[PDB]
C-alpha cells in the first residue's frame, strides 16, 4: 500500500506539477507580451493621433 | 516516479517555453512595424493632406 501510495501521488502530481510549470511560462510570457503590445499600440495610437 | 515528474514538466514547458519565445518575435516585431507603419501612414496621410 505504500508503494500504492507513492504511485498514485507520485504519478498524478507530476502531471499537475507540469502543468502549472508550463503555465508558468504563459504567465511571465504574457507579462512580457503586453509589455511589447503597449509599445505596439502606444506608437501606432499615438503616432496616428497626429 | 521522479522520471515521470521530469518526463512531463521538461517535455510540456519545453513546448510552452518556444511558444512564449515565439511571441516574444511578434511583440518585438509589431513594435517595430507598428514603428514602420506610423512613418508610412504619416508620409501618407500628411503629404496627402495638402
Do not use: C, D, P
Request: charged fraction near 30%.
Amino acid at each position: 500500500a505504500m508503494s500504492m501510495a507513492v504511485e498514485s501521488t507520485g504519478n498524478a502530481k507530476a502531471e499537475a506539477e507540469s502543468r502549472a510549470e508550463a503555465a508558468r511560462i504563459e504567465g511571465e510570457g504574457s507579462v512580457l507580451q503586453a509589455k511589447l503590445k503597449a509599445q505596439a499600440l502606444a506608437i501606432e495610437t499615438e503616432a496616428e493621433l497626429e
